[PDB]
Amino acid sequence: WHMWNTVPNAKQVIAA
């Protein structure tokens, strides 16, 4: 239920 305190592993996406 709780979220872990951690950095995201999301990929960088170009704007537009």
Q: Tokens standing for 16? A: 């537009």
Tokens standing for residue 11:
């990929």
What percentage of the chain's residues is helix, strand, coil (to nearest 5)?
0, 0, 100
Token digits of residue 7: 């950095």
CB-count burial class (<10 Å; 0-12, 13-18, 19+) for 16: exposed
Chain position carrying tokens 């872990």: 4
Q: Cα–Cα distance between 10 and 12 in angstroms, integer?
A: 7
> Rounded to whole angstroms, how far apart are CA atoms 16 and 13?
9
